[PDB]
Amino acid sequence: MSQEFISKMVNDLFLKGKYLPKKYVAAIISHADTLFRQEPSMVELENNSTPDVKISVCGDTHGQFYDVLNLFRKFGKVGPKHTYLFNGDFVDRGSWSCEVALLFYCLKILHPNNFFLNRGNHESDNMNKIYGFEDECKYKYSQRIFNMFAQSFESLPLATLINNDYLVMHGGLPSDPSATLSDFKNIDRFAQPPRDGAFMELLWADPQEANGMGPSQRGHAFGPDITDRFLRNNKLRKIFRSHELRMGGVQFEQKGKLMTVFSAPNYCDSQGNLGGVIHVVPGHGILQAGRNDDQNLIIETFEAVEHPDIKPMAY
Amino acid sequence: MSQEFISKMVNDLFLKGKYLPKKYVAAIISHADTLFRQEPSMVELENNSTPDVKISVCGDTHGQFYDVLNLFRKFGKVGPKHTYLFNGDFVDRGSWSCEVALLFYCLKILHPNNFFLNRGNHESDNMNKIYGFEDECKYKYSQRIFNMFAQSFESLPLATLINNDYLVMHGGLPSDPSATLSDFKNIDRFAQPPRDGAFMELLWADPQEANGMGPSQRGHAFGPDITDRFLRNNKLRKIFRSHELRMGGVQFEQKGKLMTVFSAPNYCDSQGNLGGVIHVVPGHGILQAGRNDDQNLIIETFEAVEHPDIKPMAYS
Ligand SMILES: [Fe+3]
Ligand SMILES: [Fe+3]
Ligand SMILES: [Fe+3]
Ligand SMILES: [Fe+3]
Ligand code: NA
C-alpha cells in the first residue's frame, strides 16, 4: 500500500467508472479489518502533545465519493501532520459507497495512526440490505465481497475520544446517568448492533433541545441535561456526533455541550445542504458567536461538487 | 498472538470441548487471511542456506485435531529451527475441522516464516457444503464465521517449492508439457477452483503408474512420463503431493519421481492407515531401498491416537 496506489485507484480506475480487481478489494477489506480489530471499542486520540497535528472530525458521507475527494482537496490530505476521523454512515444512499469504503480502507492501511473511523448505524447488515450498499456491492463485485465489507463493519470502533475533551460517536449518548467512558471502552462490538442498550444508542440516539429523554422522531432523544451530566461526570468538554443532516454542515447545539457534523453535501442530490468539518487544533481555535465557543476548535464547511450522470442508490 | 495464546486455546478450550469467543475467531481468520494474501501463488522455500532448519511436509489432516496435536508432539513444534507445510485438505470429514483450521491460522500468525499451507480441494465452497466443514462451522460459530473461513481459503497458495528441488501441491500436475513453475506462480488463485485447467489439476489430479494421461478414478491421471518430463523441464528432483490415502502414510511412487504424503491416520475412524511426513534436511537424508532414494529426505510415519466420543462429520 502506497499513496501511489491510492492515486491510481482513485484517478485511473474510480474516476473512469472502473472497478478494482476483486483480488485487491479482498486484500484491502481484509487488511483494514485486521487493523481496526486491534483497536479498542473507543479509540483515544490526542494532539495536545503534538502541537502541529491537526485532527479533523467528519460526519456522514453516505457514498458520495466526489464530495469526499473534494473534502480532501479543500481540507488537506491525511498525513503525519493531519489525522482524520469519519463518524460513520459512509455507505448507503450514495451510489459510490464501494469507492468511499475502499479509499477509507486504503487510508487506514497507509496511515494507520492518522486515520480513524467510528461505526455508524449504516455499517450494519439490516441497513445495507434496505439502503443501497448491498445491491451496489453485489452488482459491482460479488456476494462474497459484500460479506467481506459486512464483516469489516463489525470491527470498526463505536466511539473515539479526543484530547480527553471531546467524545465522538455517530448517533448520541445513552440516558443512563451511570454511563462512563470505560463502559463504552469495554463494549463487545464485533456483532450487529443490538435492539436496546448503549451499543445501539452510540449509533442511533439523537439530541433534542428539551431537557430529559424521550423516543426520537425515528433509539432515543437525549436533552441538554443528559449531555451536561455526562460531560461533567466524565471530565469532558463537548459531544461531537453526526447521524443527522444539518443545512450548515455543522451545528452548535444544546447550549454548546454538543455539535453535529454532517459531511454529505447536497444530500440525496436534493437537500442543497453544506457538509462540515471540525478541526481540533489546541489553542488555535477560531471562535464565533453562536457557532464555536471553544479555543481548540475550527468549524469549516464545504459545498457539493458535480458527479457523473448516476442517480442515488442506482443499484 | 503468542505460544501462550495457542496453548491456552488448545489446552484450556479445545481439549475441554469449548469454543473460542467469536471475536477471536474472526481476528484469527482475518489476520491469517491477510498474511497468505501477501504470498505468491507458489511459495518458494529453502533450507540449503540455513543448514539446521528442518522443513516438514504433511498431507491431509481432514479435521483430525487429536492426531494433528500428536503429529506436533512426535515431530516437534513449529519454530525458527523447524518450518512446516500442510498440503491441503485440513477441513472436512473430521469433526474438529474448526480446531485444526484455527491452530494452523494461529501458527501462521505466530511463525509467518516457519509455517505454510497449500490449498487443497476441500478448502473450497462446493466441498465444505457437502463434506462437513460448513455444518460444523455454522453449528459451532455462525454463517458469518463460515464465510470468513471460506474467504480465507481463496488466499491460500496453490503450491510450494522447496530448495528448487521439490514441488508440492495437494493433487497433481497438469498434462500440459508447456507447464512451468512461473505458470503456477502467476495463477489468479483468489476464487473458487475452475472446472478445467492447471488451477484445478494442482488441487484435483492423481498420478498413475501407467504412462500417459487419462481420466482419474474420481480431474485427470498423470503417468510417470508426464512427471519426468515436467521435472527435467523445470530442473526439479521430485513431486510431493497428497490428496490420496496411503496405508503407509507416505508412498514412494512413479519410480521415485513422486511421493504421496497423507497425514490423517486411521482415516474416517476406519482405514487403520498411518499418517506420514517428509523432512527435507539437506544432506542428512536417510535412504531406504524402496522408500527414499534421496539424501535430502527423511520419511517418517505416525499412528492414530484416541479422540472424544464423537463420530466423523458429527454436524453434517
Ligand atoms: Fe446518516
Ligand atoms: Fe446515521
Ligand atoms: Fe483429502
Ligand atoms: Fe484432496
Ligand atoms: Na485481515
Task: Give the Cα separation of A103 and B107 in Å (integer).
Answer: 31
Q: Residue B144 and residue A147: Cβ atoms within 8 Å?
A: yes
Ligand 2 centroid–CA A88 distance in Å is 7
- CA atoms A156, A158, A164, A165: torsion sign: positive
Cross-chain Cβ contact A30/B27 below 8 Å: no
Joined grid coordinates for residue B100: 485444526
Q: CA of B181 to nearest chain A CA: how many angstroms apart?
A: 21
Domains (range + CATH), chain B? 2-316 (3.60.21.10)
Q: What is the dihedral of CA B123, B124, B126, B129, to 10 degrees?
A: 60
* Chain B residues closer than 8 Å to A23 by CB: 188, 190
3-state SS, one letter per residue, for B78-142: CECCEEEEECCCCCCCCCCHHHHHHHHHHHHHHCCCCEEECCCCCCCHHHHHHHCHHHHHHHHCC
Q: Which of B34, B188, B190 sits opposite A34 (nearest CB)?
A: B34
Largest Cα–Cα distance of chain B, in whole Å? 52
Distance CA A296, CA B36 (A): 44
Q: Hey, which residues of B are catalytic here?
A: 122
CA of A282 to the centre of ligand 2 (A): 28
Give chain A positions within 8 Å (CB) of B157. none
Task: Enter the resolution in angstroms.
Answer: 2.3
Is residue B220 part of an annotated ligand binding site? no
Phi, psi of B187 (to 5 degrees): -70, 130
Q: How far apart are CA A149 and CA A125, in angstroms?
A: 10
The residues with which A33 forms a beta bridge, in sequence order, are none
Interface of B with A (CB under 8 A): 22-23, 26-27, 30-31, 33-34, 37, 144, 147-148, 150-151, 154-155, 188, 190-191
Nearest Cα to Cα of residue A32 among A94, A125, A132, A103: A103
Task: In whole angstroms, give the CA distance from residue A43 to residue A91.
Answer: 21
C-alpha cell at A268: 440525496
CA torsion angle for B96, B98, B101, B103 (degrees, to 10)? -80
Cα gap B166→B48, rounded to integer Å: 13
Query: Cell numbers of B65, please?
Result: 485435531
**Taking a C-beta distance cutoff of 8 angstroms, is the pair B109, B6 a contact?**
no
Contact B6, B82 (CB under 8 A): no
Residue B266 assigned to a binding site:
no
Return the closest-CA partner of residue A241 out of A212, A214, A202, A270: A202
